[PDB]
Design a protein around this nucleic acid. Sequence first.
DNA 1: TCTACCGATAAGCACAACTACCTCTCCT
RNA 2: AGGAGAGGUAG
DNA 3: TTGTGCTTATCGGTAGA
Lengths: 109, 76, 384, 56, 97, 174, 57, 113
Amino acid sequence: FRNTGPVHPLTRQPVADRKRFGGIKFGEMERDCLIAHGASANLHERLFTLSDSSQMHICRKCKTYANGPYCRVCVSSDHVVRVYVPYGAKLLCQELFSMGITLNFDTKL
Amino acid sequence: RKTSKFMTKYERARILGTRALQISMNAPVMVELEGETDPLEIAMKELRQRKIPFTIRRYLPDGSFEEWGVDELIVE
Amino acid sequence: LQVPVGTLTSIGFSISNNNDRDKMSVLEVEAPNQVTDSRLGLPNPDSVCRTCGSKDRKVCEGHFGVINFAYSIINPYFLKEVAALLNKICPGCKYICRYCTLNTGYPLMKFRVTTKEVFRRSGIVVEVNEESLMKLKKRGVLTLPPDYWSFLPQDSNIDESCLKPTRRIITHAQVYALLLGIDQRLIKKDIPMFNSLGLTSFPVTPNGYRRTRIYKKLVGFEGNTLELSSRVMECMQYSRLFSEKLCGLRFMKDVLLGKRSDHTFRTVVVGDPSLKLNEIGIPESIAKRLQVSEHLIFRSLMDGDTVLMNRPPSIHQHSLIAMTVRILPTTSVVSLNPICCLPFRGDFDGDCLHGYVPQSIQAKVELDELVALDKQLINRQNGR
Amino acid sequence: HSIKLKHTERGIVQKVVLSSNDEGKNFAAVSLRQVRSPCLGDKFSSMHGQKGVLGY
Amino acid sequence: GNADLPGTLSRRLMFFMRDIYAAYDGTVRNSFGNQLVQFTYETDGPVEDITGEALGSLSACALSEAAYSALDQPISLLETSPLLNLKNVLECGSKKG
Amino acid sequence: MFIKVKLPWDVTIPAEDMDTGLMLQRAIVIRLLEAFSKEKATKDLGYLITPTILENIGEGKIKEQTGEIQFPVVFNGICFKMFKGEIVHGVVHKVHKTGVFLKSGPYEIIYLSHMKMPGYEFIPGENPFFMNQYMSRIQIGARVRFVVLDTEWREAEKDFMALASIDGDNLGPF
Amino acid sequence: VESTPAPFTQACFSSPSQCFLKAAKEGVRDDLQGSIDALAWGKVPGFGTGDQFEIII
Amino acid sequence: CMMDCEAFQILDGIKGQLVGLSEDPSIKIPVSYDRALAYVESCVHYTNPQSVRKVLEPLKTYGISDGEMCVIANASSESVDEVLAFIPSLKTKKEVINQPLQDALEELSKLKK
DNA sequence: TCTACCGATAAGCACAACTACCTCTCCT
RNA sequence: AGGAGAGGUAG
DNA sequence: TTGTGCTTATCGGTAGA
Ligand SMILES: [Mg+2]
Ligand SMILES: [Zn+2]
Ligand SMILES: [Zn+2]
Ligand SMILES: [Zn+2]
């Protein structure tokens, strides 16, 4: 059983060790079954809320990723929006940038 | 228009969840409930009494949407 | 400060160029011994971040740094696009000439990319068709003309190869020399991303992410550029997305597809006919430690709460059943009605059922309205 | 430094053994004993392949 | 052996049928580009009140249940297993040669 | 440049008070008052005091966290832009050896440098320093007109600091 | 054939590196129309819950 | 457009509204009200109808931009040598004779008794 | 009478060969 | 703290 | 090792100018 515990160094997910308050893997089959049932709030909570939760800052003017937030590609702008995406998405973006692929994000708000 | 005019299970569940979340945050209840200590019970009572001030916007796949209300729709 | 919130949509894909690579990197020094700098990531041996504030690897993101190259390097991803274009366009006519007419004695050339076959370098090596060579051999021509390779400008990056007079490794400087004079319309038609042609920089992984030795060896670059291109190609293949355990599709499954959540319990299940079908027995020893989120901040599990029970693997959608928590004096075990074993397709011989406790109120409201036992009385497979 | 017991580690100290090899590295062994009474979740097996857990 | 076949088949069928959902107009549409899969649901009654249900997910789950609840015994040297027949039937584009 | 320009907002209303449909407009204006009161600052726009005219309201969007609902409302209000080449008045608060203070309202702080006024010697024979070398006495409370220059801003406070120059005519009080 | 680009779903199916490289070379635009794409980026699928919206007035 | 006159008239409205139902269940901010009382007491006009109409008459009869009206009205120069030395936009221009400007100066002098 | 792309065959070159969990023992 | 080699449990 | 997809590479091929 687990309520709160340490996270993995690579991804911000509960450790698999049982003695260290490990969590239960939410597999693909369970996600498919929950989609078939039609419950999205439970699926959203299990994949984003109780799972690795992080934040990413995207510049409104230029479609780039900015690290308050500040984008060096453009000038210091006061229009920067924050999106709520899992830490796995940020890890994938970092991996894509390392391999030589740049992603552009067009926020709707 | 061009709708079934029936409240689906998913929409009903979402409305009940939203109303329960609102009530759990110390919100006044439009309907009068006696001996009720659970927000879900009050939400279900309001749904049965169709006094919820909610409107449903159904997004059609073509891009358009139709505005409905919980009082206009019926619950099976 | 404070920034507005918004949704994410319309993800675009493009190949990184030098401009975005330089703009994204912050404090990108070119020191060989400063790979693990104090300005990139927290896990550096100083515990202080220059760009961000002090944190516990929870409020600081992984900063990026990009090294610089003395000479221009062609992009390996566009290597095939350039190799195919050089085969069609004549190397000394720049049209769609000695290299065009067959009566001049000059055989045709084939442009291709080798893969760790000759010098362990993924570059452009032009080859002459051997069928035409035999035709020249039968006419009395044994060796190639001395002025055959006059279209290649002199390059100082060339080194001692001595492979064969018929094959030559094209220098990266020669690639730009051959591309000059060609109309931009033809180049843009084959290569959509013209701005990413020149690769004058290469980024390094943040300290908070993880190849490091190769990146350190790339700080000092001089002489031939083919070795640098080979090093870049070898370093790009160390990414987790490339196939070789946590790499490739397994990385995707273990990061984005499959995740682990909190507020989960896993215990062995036994039979209890006295309990109702829609009720699940929860031991008192575990219920007092499992905490739920109720708005008045955590309270222990009690009777009336709903949990999502699942048996791995989930072969059908009826494995997910929401049951009400019923506290029992038994410990280190969960009690389930023997009738409810059919939806779970399990028996009482060592099967373990792991549940999920919903924390949000809306999740609980939707759990017993759609995933409850009374809602799943009709089988969706056969209608029985 | 010191080694602490984990969440599911418990018992009563039975014996402490101290030993060292020829290289000079010291080894310490501590044994913990506990009684395992048949609980509800325990699984029992027969001599003919019958497998089951304790129901009640 | 043969334990991986039902899982792989179920995953590959889910990846195809996950996007299928029923629209408010009564048609069956895919999530990618609102592609029309079926103009009208071909059920033989008796209630047409299903609007937001994921029909493709239900069908794929039913087929996965059928695959898992099936034997792997080769019936004969010539005949195939009841799961092998399902695997061959579900894969039509692979047997083009 | 006191042009009353429109300014949309996305003020959110908590679920603590959602009732009285016949008097729902009372709750909307109260939430609007707390919207600009929390910020009470701007970067390049200026200041706003009261929502005099309400143009229109929007549909209530519900976001599922802590019971919060949003309301898009567009309205016009009072604004002030410090354009370059404007003669404005101000009152003096204190006199120091460096950075003479000028208070053109408590909305901003104005500092007077050395290279703004005519050359003079600081009079240390009295309590407050005087600038009567050019036949003009300046004290606290007297209104003095001056030209404005390019204003600056901060990161957290974002105060609209500027420089006061008396290089123009009609210097001193009137 | 349907002229619908889904690079993320194709990468999640098999060979993510080749799919991502091809998408970057072609410069396609992912609209996150799929359910798995929305789930991976913290968005509701929209099949049962999320297809409609709620408005107070 | 509120420079001196109509800005003061609406400030009396919020002060007349403050005395009615002064209690507030929310948290008020006191620096917003201090910016209104400590800045409107610089220059005050007498009447709204004849003051806002007279200042807009030269906008129709003469050619003056929007930004030029605000600086001149707030400065309120008392002569003709100050208008040609404050703003650099009026240097080397012959679109308007100075005598009509002097008549407008007298016209602005009679509004303020 | 000498060239163009065009049908079938060899030869590398890739991905893929199930979920959900538990221990121990060895490096690095 | 992190990875590789074996054995084991459930459908 | 296999089991299929997948991209180079060679043998001849007939048709039209
Ligand atoms: Mg069993
Ligand atoms: Zn920017
Ligand atoms: Zn940092
Ligand atoms: Zn040519």
